[PDB]
Scaffold this active site. Structure first.
Site, PDB file in Angstrom:
ATOM      1  N   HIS A  32      54.741  47.047  33.327  1.00 16.80           N
ATOM      2  CA  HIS A  32      55.493  46.209  34.256  1.00 16.80           C
ATOM      3  C   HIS A  32      56.259  45.072  33.546  1.00 16.80           C
ATOM      4  CE1 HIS A  32      55.263  44.701  38.742  1.00 16.80           C
ATOM      5  NE2 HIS A  32      56.519  44.641  38.242  1.00 16.80           N
TER       6      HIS A  32
ATOM      7  N   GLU B  43      54.304  51.444  38.001  1.00 19.50           N
ATOM      8  CA  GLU B  43      55.283  50.399  37.618  1.00 19.50           C
ATOM      9  C   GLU B  43      55.657  50.512  36.132  1.00 19.50           C
ATOM     10  OE1 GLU B  43      52.954  46.902  39.422  1.00 19.50           O
ATOM     11  OE2 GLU B  43      54.624  46.862  40.867  1.00 19.50           O
TER      12      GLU B  43
ATOM     13  N   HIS C  34      40.323  48.095  43.076  1.00 21.94           N
ATOM     14  CA  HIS C  34      40.047  47.717  41.657  1.00 21.94           C
ATOM     15  C   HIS C  34      38.533  47.698  41.399  1.00 21.94           C
ATOM     16  CE1 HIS C  34      43.712  46.698  39.472  1.00 21.94           C
ATOM     17  NE2 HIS C  34      44.200  46.102  40.589  1.00 21.94           N
TER      18      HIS C  34
ATOM     19  N   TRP D 117      56.087  37.957  48.869  1.00 24.13           N
ATOM     20  CA  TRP D 117      56.937  37.331  47.861  1.00 24.13           C
ATOM     21  C   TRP D 117      58.375  37.266  48.387  1.00 24.13           C
ATOM     22  CZ3 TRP D 117      53.718  41.473  46.982  1.00 24.13           C
ATOM     23  CH2 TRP D 117      54.306  42.752  46.978  1.00 24.13           C
TER      24      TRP D 117
ATOM     25  N   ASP E  97      48.035  44.333  37.173  1.00 19.38           N
ATOM     26  CA  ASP E  97      47.814  43.029  37.814  1.00 19.38           C
ATOM     27  C   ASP E  97      46.322  42.766  38.082  1.00 19.38           C
ATOM     28  OD1 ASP E  97      48.021  40.724  39.483  1.00 19.38           O
ATOM     29  OD2 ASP E  97      48.744  41.883  41.200  1.00 19.38           O
TER      30      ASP E  97
ATOM     31  N   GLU F 132      51.407  51.705  48.208  1.00 18.36           N
ATOM     32  CA  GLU F 132      50.912  50.337  48.510  1.00 18.36           C
ATOM     33  C   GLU F 132      51.672  49.819  49.740  1.00 18.36           C
ATOM     34  OE1 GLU F 132      51.111  47.675  44.913  1.00 18.36           O
ATOM     35  OE2 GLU F 132      50.554  49.436  43.677  1.00 18.36           O
ATOM     36  N   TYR F 133      51.004  49.307  50.736  1.00 16.84           N
ATOM     37  CA  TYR F 133      51.705  48.683  51.883  1.00 16.84           C
ATOM     38  C   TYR F 133      50.809  47.563  52.412  1.00 16.84           C
ATOM     39  CZ  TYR F 133      49.020  51.158  55.552  1.00 16.84           C
ATOM     40  OH  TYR F 133      48.020  51.666  56.312  1.00 16.84           O
ATOM     41  N   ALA F 134      51.367  46.688  53.252  1.00 16.78           N
ATOM     42  CA  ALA F 134      50.573  45.679  53.991  1.00 16.78           C
ATOM     43  C   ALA F 134      49.766  44.827  53.000  1.00 16.78           C
ATOM     44  CB  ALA F 134      49.652  46.358  54.998  1.00 16.78           C
ATOM     45  N   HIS F 135      50.421  44.055  52.154  1.00 14.16           N
ATOM     46  CA  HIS F 135      49.797  43.158  51.170  1.00 14.16           C
ATOM     47  C   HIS F 135      48.862  42.158  51.848  1.00 14.16           C
ATOM     48  CE1 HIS F 135      49.928  40.178  47.745  1.00 14.16           C
ATOM     49  NE2 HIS F 135      49.928  41.373  47.057  1.00 14.16           N
TER      50      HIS F 135
ATOM     51  N   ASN G 155      50.020  38.504  36.332  1.00 11.22           N
ATOM     52  CA  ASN G 155      50.457  39.647  37.139  1.00 11.22           C
ATOM     53  C   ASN G 155      51.438  40.488  36.305  1.00 11.22           C
ATOM     54  OD1 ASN G 155      51.597  41.471  38.916  1.00 11.22           O
ATOM     55  ND2 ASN G 155      52.281  39.954  40.423  1.00 11.22           N
TER      56      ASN G 155
ATOM     57  N   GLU H  28      50.660  51.288  32.524  1.00 11.91           N
ATOM     58  CA  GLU H  28      51.518  50.405  33.306  1.00 11.91           C
ATOM     59  C   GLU H  28      52.252  49.469  32.351  1.00 11.91           C
ATOM     60  OE1 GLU H  28      50.159  48.177  36.902  1.00 11.91           O
ATOM     61  OE2 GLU H  28      52.073  47.089  36.792  1.00 11.91           O
TER      62      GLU H  28
ATOM     63  N   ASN I 257      49.699  31.691  34.146  1.00 11.64           N
ATOM     64  CA  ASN I 257      48.804  32.424  35.033  1.00 11.64           C
ATOM     65  C   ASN I 257      49.516  32.658  36.364  1.00 11.64           C
ATOM     66  OD1 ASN I 257      47.967  30.355  37.151  1.00 11.64           O
ATOM     67  ND2 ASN I 257      47.671  29.264  35.211  1.00 11.64           N
TER      68      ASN I 257
END
Ligand code: PTQ
Ligand code: PTQ
Ligand code: MG
Ligand code: MG
Lengths: 1014, 598
Positions: free
Chosen positions: A409, A452, A348, A990, A192, A528-531, A93, A407, A588
């Site tokens: 990150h 990111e 993706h 998370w 990711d 991005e919302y609601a994973h 990630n 990106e 990983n």
């Protein structure tokens, strides 16, 4: 070439690569261009190539430039070479998959050597220019043609083109391509996703004449009410300018020509030195144009012809044109003058067998499923897509955010490269080439600077570059706290509706508060919302309530569309779904690669139906007998819509009917229902309405349900007594047991444990395990978060439950007594659950067995105020029997939880036992149904007000098994019946995200069940 | 190296070149840094070098990498090789001196091969990092050390540095430098001046320790009446971070210490991933600071020391600090809260015997004559100057406009390259490296994006880059009609006081009318006015009457300071002043090279 090491130098991103431009086919006939027929001037080189793998580029033998290696295999192109077994895919990630030491890469740098032998036509070499186009190569490559070096390219997600005119000969030609896994471009590609490599998009040859169209741009401008448009087309040429050269642009709607213009070359004066001799600008007036939107994707066809003054065509190019205007005005994002509400998802490019190779059939399948679930927008996470994707979004109607391949990150701090001017060159090629490729697509409404990468001066420079070359679309960028000077839209990720998360330097405010900060005027759209990881989307309704109430909250993109799992094979050659770490890849990020609303084979998760319902385009209100229907369409009238209604008393249908919808965009319609039946029988009356599309569309079948809603009407409470039975149950008291007999039925209570330990109908035992209290669940992905055995996160729910002893607590008997009443037997029990001297829970129960053979169970539980709130409060047992069907009266038909149950409806449901199990790839608690009043399974019936799940897998087995293919059915059926169940969360995965109203924090709980045999 | 042709590729502007930074001397003693004494760690390589001229880079024999050619001469460095008779200088104004065919250059591409044999001390090779610095080479060059290839550079007017630690040996070392007259960088250097070539600024060796100061920036902030200041210093290091490493910044006024601060490394949190472990920011309070201006150039001295916690010095760096604030408020350019009136001139780096080689004595002579004639400001037309120029403007008091080396006047249309994204890389190196070199000088008050290159999206991108990294100075740019979105100041050239000149697309309004156009709020400062060619400056009084009467007319820069004539000799060896076309150069723009007040 081995001494320059161009793949370790951020100053070199290409050698000999041609300029970026919109897609070209070089037609030699205007009709073939208009109708979009295949062009003889564009050949595909997709098919069988030769391939050899090497551990490093220094291991590649020199003979490979001249002739095929004998040890090479034949493989299909396009492909990822990790999908053919040459080395392992890596799922990581944030942490980079190589040592962080920019701009160097490991000396062990896996190298793929591809080659192809091919014929070129004689006609291609006499005249004109032959180019090769690689639509995508990961990560950097050198190219040779007939032994001679041609060029070098980086950036995996945009095409690379090279002129082969000087290298080709008539007869057999050979290409050789050397592809490196790692390059300095890898530092800017830390998305990711699975890290793979190869020639993973199409390869083609294009023939253009020497005098040629080298670029063209199309722009549309409107009057105040969109009744008159000007199409402006800028065309540029290359080659020798002559006075006889002319350009014609024509605009077609179907087979009707709508507008046309013709001019010689020569732009207007630009500055003190003159104008562009090699450009021209045509303006075409269009009266009452049909406007493009996601609701009605009206397209025109623009044909551009380079010809001589006497009428001979040299070459034609074409594209689809949509007339629309996107602007931000007074803090609102507007399309065609109306404010958008974005029902978006992140997507993706992923296929479980082919990795990162996209085909047309897969793309069409994703678009139909999105529109059928009320999505109108898609975010290219996080790089430019295959060129066919934008064509399909233009034709079917989706808004697209197009995103640069940048990106970083895993850098510390996140802006280490994007604040450095030595990386400004590499970043600018990723942004400027995307805009030059995609700027003619009507579906692209917003540009994004990537993802990111913190906030650096390089982002400000590139924000301003796009605003200057393409003022017709807003620019967004989330890094550096989502509201920097490099964005037109506030675009946070995972901000909550009501709760602030005040991190240093980059706080995530609640979205309602962010809007009103001193000085803030921009619209807010969550990128991005609601994973959606595993069993998730709890609290989704709370976002959609806020989006509809606040004008400047204009929606967001769910994270994300499809699980990124890959297929592996066991010993018997049976396929199974694999995730991070299953390929020996280390380090990983395990199951964090599966965040989709659909499984990798495009089968839905239960959360997909919650998204469909919250995103509906019709909203309903009930007032007495009147339904008010509101349209949330901006542009269409409801011309394919029929409202069905049904009234039912506890599952039994009583009245039904249909009414056509006739509602203007943003309008209302009142529907008056006939005088509803008044039944005498007890129970709750329910009204359900559903919107049905009677005719098929481009994206849906006849009879598609697009929207629904359900309300309670009148209730009659039951004031009749149970029929007085003649038979009395008999109580037998031994030292070990209480035993109760009535007819053929028998119940046995164990006096040392204090639980119902067995039940007989005739001589057939009914239980394999005693009926016991249960306070725990097999933890969901949201309960675990980022916690692992190496690195424990003490704040996650699973870690709090383990530290407190909830999984280990032992029941101790406090009381177990029996009594004969007049017509019943009464058993009273009490238990305490302890861990190291601390009492966690107390339960007190009564069991009342009457002469009708019913067993009424009353439960009272106390929870210590200082223990973490429990996941559930209920009973569990293992039944001896397996039945085919489950029948219930309650919310359904799909899995539903206390903070994800708006989409479920109350009714009588009936499913095979296997539909009651949701096969998440990472096993967890699953399959719960809430709001249930009656459950039938085999001869048993439970009645009450409860939540249940029923399956062949224990909570223990689900918690100990890491992959769904390793689960085995247990003997009999595990039933869990809960009075209360905690929410599942899903704002992110998370950090703890279950809202306070969904936690079991009341300290005292009560519920009741009747267990009978009907 | 002959097969890659890096000088014909606008995507390659350097290979192996180190990051740009403010001037460094690497002192090993804090007192030597404070008092600005010569540093043993910085050696000059100026003096006698060997030189051979060739018609093209394919004509250079391979033996030249290993040993001296017998047919080479001894010449002084720095120099322009046209001033020693090897080929002709060319004077052209607008037309490019080569065929316009970007990015290719002629196959006849005069090549200068320079070489030097030199000793390196034993102590330099045991520890630390040795770098070579070329302050300016025109137009592109490849460098070898003891036969091995080191690197490549373009942009003639900013320094190029290369690490030589891995190439040097004890005893005799040999550098070889191959300099090309034309390169793809020539397309961005079409300034109106003599076109010359060579190693024309200083060459030096610098020794730093392995753990070292790699950059530092100095910024000053004030209260509303300039009675309290905060000096903020950001320091970055390279090498191995240790817990015992400390940074001290001290501020001196003469021999009195005024303020001091000390910290370990580790910046504040910047984002979700943390902060810079290898940076620190000190804040120093200063009460009643003496303010810098052109009228009173009060300076302080800032010393930066990298040392251990127990007090051992590793290295020191220093610069001059002037406390002043430059801002635009309500349409006026303000210094220290008061509106400026710019008495400016444009100045080229030109000497009649040495061409484009500047020495200290010439620079001081120009500054004294400017101040004695009531000038207060100077525009670097049209490229960054020799580094000593900004030091002298700080000490004597002149406002400086510092300008990027970008001019594409001879293109058709003028923005053909600056509107193309393939040239965005080459242009960004010219702007970002100038700002990283000069941002600590108090005399620099305005940045400029270059000159006469039309208006392209590349200019907007770079305007916004400077505003973001250095918000303390305005940015100006004249191309595309002098009032585009890429400028903070309206900055026309040769607009008249009362008469409009309405050209298509790029009109030059009268300056009094330009101010009041619907929507316009910016100050107006002419970047070039009053062309002083021959017997000229008629109507000069009319500009100065308007400057004094209108608040938003804040002055301008005369074109220009000194005539660009060269010296030739007749038969009797008598010197005479020569201009375009007197060297057999063709085409040429004749006497248009002489526009000076002196
Ligand atoms: O699907 C995972 C998500 O992870 C978080 S990082 C914080 C969580 C995390 C960090 C490190 C390893 C695993 C998870 C990202 O911000 C999201 O865009 C998305 O990629
Ligand atoms: O000293 C000459 C001046 O020439 C004019 S071009 C118009 C005049 C011209 C054009 C071509 C050849 C000669 C003169 C420039 O704009 C000024 O900056 C300055 O360089
Ligand atoms: Mg990421
Ligand atoms: Mg000029």
């Amino acid at each position: 070439v081995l001494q320059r090491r161009d793949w370790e130098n951020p100053g070199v991103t290409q050698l000999n690569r041609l300029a970026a431009h919109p897609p070209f086919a070089s037609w030699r006939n205007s009709e073939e261009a208009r109708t979009d027929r295949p062009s003889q001037q564009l050949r595909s080189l997709n098919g069988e190539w030769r391939f050899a793998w090497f551990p490093a580029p220094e291991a590649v033998p020199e003979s490979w430039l001249e002739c095929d290696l004998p040890e090479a295999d034949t493989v299909v192109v396009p492909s990822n070479w990790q999908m053919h077994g040459y080395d392992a895919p890596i799922y990581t990630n944030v942490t980079y998959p190589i040592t962080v030491n920019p701009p160097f890469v490991p000396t062990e740098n896996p190298t793929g050597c591809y080659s192809l032998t091919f014929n070129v036509d004689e006609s291609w070499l006499q005249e004109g220019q032959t180019r090769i186009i690689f639509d995508g190569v990961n990560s950097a490559f050198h190219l040779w043609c007939n032994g001679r070096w041609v060029g070098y390219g980086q950036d995996s997600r945009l095409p690379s083109e090279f002129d082969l005119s000087a290298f080709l000969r008539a007869g057999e030609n050979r290409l050789a391509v050397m592809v490196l896994r790692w390059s300095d471009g890898s530092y800017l590609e830390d998305q990711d996703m699975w890290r793979m490599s190869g020639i993973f998009r199409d390869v083609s040859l294009l023939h253009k004449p020497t005098t040629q169209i080298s670029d063209f741009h199309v722009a549309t401008r409107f009057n105040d009410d969109f009744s008159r448009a000007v199409l402006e087309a800028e065309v540029q040429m290359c080659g020798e300018l002559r006075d006889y050269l002319r350009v014609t642009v024509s605009l077609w709607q179907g087979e009707t020509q709508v507008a046309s213009g013709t001019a010689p070359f020569g732009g207007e004066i630009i500055d003190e030195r003159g104008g562009y001799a090699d450009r021209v600008t045509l303006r075409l007036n269009v009266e009452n144009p049909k406007l493009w939107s996601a609701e009605i994707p009206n397209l025109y066809r623009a044909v551009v012809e380079l010809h001589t003054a006497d009428g001979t065509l040299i070459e034609a190019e074409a594209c689809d044109v949509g007339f629309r205007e996107v602007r931000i005005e007074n803090g609102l994002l507007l399309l065609n003058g109306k404010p958008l509400l974005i029902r978006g998802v992140n997507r993706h490019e992923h296929h479980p067998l082919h990795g990162q190779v996209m085909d047309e059939q897969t793309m069409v399948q994703d678009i139909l499923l999105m529109k059928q679930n009320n999505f109108n927008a898609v975010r290219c996470s996080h790089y430019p897509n295959h060129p066919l994707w934008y064509t399909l979004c233009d034709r079917y109607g989706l808004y697209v955010v197009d995103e640069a391949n940048i990106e970083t990150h895993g850098m510390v701090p996140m802006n280490r490269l994007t604040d450095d001017p030595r990386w400004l060159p590499a970043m600018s090629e990723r942004v400027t080439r995307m805009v030059q490729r995609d700027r003619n697509h009507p579906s692209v409404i917003i540009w994004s600077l990537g993802n990111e990468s913190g906030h650096g001066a390089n982002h400000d420079a590139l924000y301003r570059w796009i605003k200057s070359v393409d003022p017709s679309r807003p620019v967004q960028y989330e890094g550096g706290g989502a509201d920097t000077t490099a964005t037109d839209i506030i675009c946070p990720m995972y901000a909550r509706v009501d709760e602030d998360q005040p991190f240093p330097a980059v706080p995530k405010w609640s979205i309602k508060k962010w809007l009103s900060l001193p000085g803030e005027t921009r619209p807010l759209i969550l990128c991005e919302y609601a994973h959606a990881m595993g069993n998730s989307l709890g609290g989704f309704a709370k976002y959609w309530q806020a989006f509809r109430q606040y004008p400047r909250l204009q929606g967001g993109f769910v994270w994300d569309w499809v699980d990124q799992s890959l297929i592996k094979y066991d010993e018997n050659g049976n396929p199974w779904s694999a995730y991070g770490g299953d390929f020996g890849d280390t380090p990983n990020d395990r199951q964090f690669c599966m965040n989709g609303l659909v499984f990798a084979d495009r089968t839905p998760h239960p959360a997909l139906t919650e998204a469909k319902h919250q995103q509906q385009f019709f909203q309903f209100r009930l007032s007495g007998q009147t339904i008010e229907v509101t349209s949330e369409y901006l542009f269409r009238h409801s011309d394919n819509e029929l409202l069905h209604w049904m009234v039912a008393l506890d599952g039994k249908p009583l009245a039904s009917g249909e009414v056509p919808l006739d509602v203007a965009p943003q309008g209302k319609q009142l529907i008056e229902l006939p005088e509803l039946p008044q039944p005498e029988s007890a129970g709750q009356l329910w009204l359900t309405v559903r919107v049905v599309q009677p005719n098929a569309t481009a994206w849906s079948e006849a009879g598609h349900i697009s929207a629904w809603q359900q309300w309670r009407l009148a209730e009659n409470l039951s004031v009749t007594l149970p029929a007085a039975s003649h038979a009395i149950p008999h109580l037998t008291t031994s030292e070990m047991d209480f035993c109760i007999e009535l007819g053929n039925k028998r119940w046995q209570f164990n006096r040392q444990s204090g639980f119902l330990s067995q039940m007989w109908i005739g001589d057939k035992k009914q239980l394999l395990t005693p009926l016991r209290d249960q306070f725990t669940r097999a933890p969901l992905d949201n309960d675990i978060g980022v916690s692992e055995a190496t690195r424990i996160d003490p704040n996650a729910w699973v870690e709090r439950w383990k530290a407190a002893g909830h999984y280990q607590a032992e029941a101790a008997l406090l009381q177990c007594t029996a009594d004969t009443l007049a017509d019943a037997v009464l058993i009273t029990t009490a238990h305490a659950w302890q861990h190291q001297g601390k009492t966690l829970f107390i339960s007190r129960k009564t069991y009342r067995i009457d002469g009708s053979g019913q067993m009424a169970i009353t439960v009272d539980v106390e929870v210590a105020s200082d223990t973490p709130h429990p996941a559930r409060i209920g009973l569990n047992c293992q039944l001896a029997q397996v039945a085919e069907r489950v029948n219930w009266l309650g919310l359904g038909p799909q899995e539903n939880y206390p903070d994800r149950l708006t989409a479920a409806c109350f009714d009588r449901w009936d499913l095979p036992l296997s539909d009651m199990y949701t096969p998440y790839v990472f096993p967890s608690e699953n399959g719960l149904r809430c709001g249930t009043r009656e459950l039938n399974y085999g001869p048993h019936q439970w009645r009450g007000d409860f939540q249940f799940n029923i399956s062949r897998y224990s909570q223990q087995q689900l918690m100990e098994t890491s992959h769904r293919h390793l689960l085995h059915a247990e003997e009999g059926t595990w039933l869990n019946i809960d009075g209360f169940h905690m929410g599942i969360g899903g704002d992110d995965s998370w950090s703890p995200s279950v809202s306070a109203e969904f936690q079991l924090s009341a300290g005292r709980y009560h519920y009741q069940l009747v267990w009978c045999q009907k």
